[PDB]
Design a protein. Structure first.
Lengths: 100, 397, 397, 133, 50
């Protein structure tokens, strides 16, 4: 995603990118991005840890998930809004056209 | 160094051209330059301070770049930017100040601080840009070994000097002849007095002369020359040369006769003016020589005759004088003047942070002391320090 | 002419924005402009100098363009550029100087030198650009015949004048009444004296007045007006009006009574201030009129009473005065002031090259003589010559 | 307010960089900014003056944009431009002066004149630029 | 056009014009070579719009 997307079509790091094995390409990308919309996706995605913490109806540790996600959904709405402003330059035409 | 400069014009032309609304295509050329920076920086660590009462704040980098399309700018865009600028501002301030206090006998013309020494590094040069700020403009032209030059309204070329010279005196100090003056900043006032009103002088004329040697050559000087020295036109009780007693000066003023001002350069007369009061131009000089005379009035009404008897006591002391003011001039060396805040900025930062006296500058950056012994080292350090003050004033006043 | 201008801002914005590092994109718009020049020039041939001690120099053009290729700038790129700039600099200098010396009565406005006359040619007009330099800005607006205007600090509007007028005098000069003054630059000091302390004057009040007619209208003037004329507050021995003898002035100062300053324009009062000392604004005027009075003190302590007897001899001379200084103002005509180096630049280039006195300007570009008879021809020549000096100072100081 | 500012640097950097003979590309970035203005303006009408001896003049916009066909500047291009600038100059003058006389104790830090109060409106912000003065 | 018609028989081909996608190719030929007649075409065509 990071490479064949965002970064260049968004014009940012035209230095395409390079991960190792600790902190994640989806997250660090954050510290280095200037489009808030884009920027929230990043922390939320890198931080949405399947809230491994539950003890219901009497002893049922069933690693749960965000009200947010649940049906607050917005995440989606925001995942979209961020997308709504990724429409720009760098390489051949048949590219942005097709992608966007 | 030049590096440093950019950092600012970057921010200024930034905190200036980036406002809610403007059209992108006005900053396209700019935006770029900006990002380019962030990159070169990120991955670097710095440290400023450590001297006197100057805090030691540490800095790290990890931002990125702005770059998402938009015909026009939305408020949100700015705020996310301004937040990044403010860290650089608060940075540079600390960078400037840290290199604005250290002095070095040896290479007082080179970078000092751990902060800047690191900047002159090659890997940072990729950031230079738009050097049009009068000071940096001259910083370059010099580094290349070429002809510099600055502009000053009421320059500060004369170290304070207020004194007299008695050419004829006696214990009672009742029949003196000599001159007294005040050289300070861009002004000179000098008076020649003769208690005897040239009664026994050849042609009843007493000659006077005042020579002032500049520590640096001034070119293109616009100067006001006026007859009379108001400062020495009133009654005074003055200490004797040896400090053992006090004498009385009771002036009566006559027009200076045969006034001749010479602006010399290395002993050569470059400009000479004979009795010309008002505005005169001195195009290149390192010395000013003012010659003037007191001529006993050949014809005197009774009231005048009464002031000048043939024999002592001499109670009214004939005095002639001149006033010369350098309104503007150009100097190849930095100087303090009546408009620029450089000296005050440097002096103020050092005072505020209780910076200890160093090996180059006189205590308190005292101007008179500095210009009196304006050594090459003091000038190189002063220029470095003045150029930094000017870089700082583009953002912080 | 405008042509000329560009040539510089080209070089400045060049020797400034072009350095080891920066991105192409910041100069793209610039680079172009530059090349465009080289082209128009190449092939053409010039000639400067030939007058007085000014060397004659010929110049030819045959230069390569600029690599519009690269991304960033490598040291090598600069040096190959700077080498080309230096030939233009050393050129322009010689061009300016050559046209900064010639004067002309008939058409003292248009170009003179073989060098410039050739530039006004149409085929070169392909070079104009960025005319934000205050002077050229006004040069244009004047061609289109519109409202110009410059800014000055301590302007130089008053030709030097230091004299007196005795309204009541007699051979012994023991009971005089009149005024003495000094008008010079942006300042006026005037004193009114009455040896009799208005003893026989109606209402024991002596009226004084000082009128100064400016050679050009000043608008937007910020002025300091203070009571007293320090310059005329001390004892003096002065030459009589006919030069046959000398009189004695022994002032004692009283506050000027009923002070009224009027700034008139074509005989009409535009601004009037009654006894207001400090900072006042005169928005548009060609004349200043200062009226003030000496009023004999109605009540006097013994020490005061002793200075002013009912009968002569009058030994203490009652004096009242005013001091007026124009700190800043705007004028539609160029003038010398306390900050700009134009007059000094023009005067200096002419002096250095031993340029012979011409038909327009007074010997030595003497300011007093120039402003005293500020004819249309002198003003047009002065403006041309000042504008060129300002173009030159963008590169050579 | 900041709005106001632009209006000028626009004209200055205009009556300055727009002369008989400069290559188009030296004003490409500029030209744009300019037009952008004309647009936002045209249609809306203004009132200046209405105090002391200050005249009440009415200003109106419905102009056409600036042709960017040109490689350099042909004289003709300028004159058709200068004619448009002069209406804005004579305008701003009247705008400045009108807001340079009104005072207010309560809020004497904000716009007073009917002329400027209308500028702080949002639909105009689209102009602000080069705040270096 | 730029690489087979104008440069190639106008003694202007030295590099044979290298372009690698996006930015504008007419455009850039404008600010490169000099000639008035040729030069007007460029601006009029390039910046020509509706
Ligand atoms: Zn001053």
């Amino acid at each position: 995603i990071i490479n064949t997307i965002i970064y260049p079509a968004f014009g940012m790091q035209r230095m395409h990118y390079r991960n190792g094995d600790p902190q994640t390409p989806f997250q660090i990308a954050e510290q280095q991005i200037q489009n808030f919309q884009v920027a929230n996706w990043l922390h939320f995605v890198n931080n949405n840890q399947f809230r491994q913490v539950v003890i219901d109806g009497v002893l049922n540790q069933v690693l749960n998930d965000n009200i947010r996600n649940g049906h607050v959904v917005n995440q989606l709405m925001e995942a979209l809004m961020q997308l709504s402003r990724q429409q720009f330059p760098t390489m051949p035409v048949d590219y942005k056209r097709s992608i966007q | 160094m030049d590096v440093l400069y950019s950092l600012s014009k970057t921010l200024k032309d930034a905190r200036d051209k980036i406002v809610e609304g403007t059209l992108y295509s006005n900053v396209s050329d700019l935006i770029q330059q900006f990002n380019q920076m962030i990159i070169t920086m990120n991955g670097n660590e710095f440290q400023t301070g450590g001297i006197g009462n100057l805090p030691i704040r540490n800095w790290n980098f990890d931002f990125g770049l702005l770059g998402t399309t938009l015909l026009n700018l939305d408020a949100n865009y700015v705020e996310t930017a301004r937040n990044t600028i403010d860290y650089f501002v608060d940075f540079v301030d600390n960078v400037c100040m840290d290199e604005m206090v250290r002095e070095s006998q040896r290479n007082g013309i080179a970078p000092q601080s751990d902060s800047l020494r690191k900047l002159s590094g090659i890997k940072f040069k990729r950031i230079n840009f738009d050097n049009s700020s009068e000071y940096i403009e001259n910083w370059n032209l010099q580094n290349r070994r070429q002809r510099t030059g600055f502009t000053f309204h009421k320059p500060n070329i004369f170290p304070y000097s207020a004194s007299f010279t008695l050419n004829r005196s006696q214990p009672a100090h009742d029949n003196l002849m000599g001159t007294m003056w005040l050289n300070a900043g861009s002004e000179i006032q000098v008076a020649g007095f003769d208690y005897s009103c040239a009664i026994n002088a050849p042609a009843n004329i007493q000659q006077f002369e005042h020579i002032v040697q500049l520590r640096r050559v001034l070119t293109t000087a616009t100067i006001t020359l006026l007859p009379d020295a108001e400062r020495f036109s009133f009654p005074r009780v003055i200490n004797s040369a040896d400090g053992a007693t006090t004498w009385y000066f009771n002036p009566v003023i006559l027009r200076p006769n045969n006034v001749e001002v010479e602006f010399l350069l290395n002993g050569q007369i470059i400009n000479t003016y004979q009795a010309r009061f008002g505005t005169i131009i001195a195009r290149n000089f390192d010395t000013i020589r003012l010659s003037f005379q007191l001529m006993r009035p050949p014809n005197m009404t009774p009231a005048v005759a009464a002031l000048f008897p043939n024999a002592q006591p001499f109670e009214h002391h004939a005095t002639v004088g001149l006033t010369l003011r350098i309104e503007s001039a150009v100097c190849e060396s930095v100087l303090a003047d009546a408009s620029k805040t450089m000296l005050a900025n440097v002096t103020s930062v050092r005072q505020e942070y209780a910076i200890p006296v160093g090996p180059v500058f006189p205590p308190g950056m005292n101007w008179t002391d500095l210009i009196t012994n304006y050594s090459p080292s003091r000038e190189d350090n002063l220029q470095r320090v003045f150029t930094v003050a000017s870089i700082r004033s583009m953002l912080v006043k």
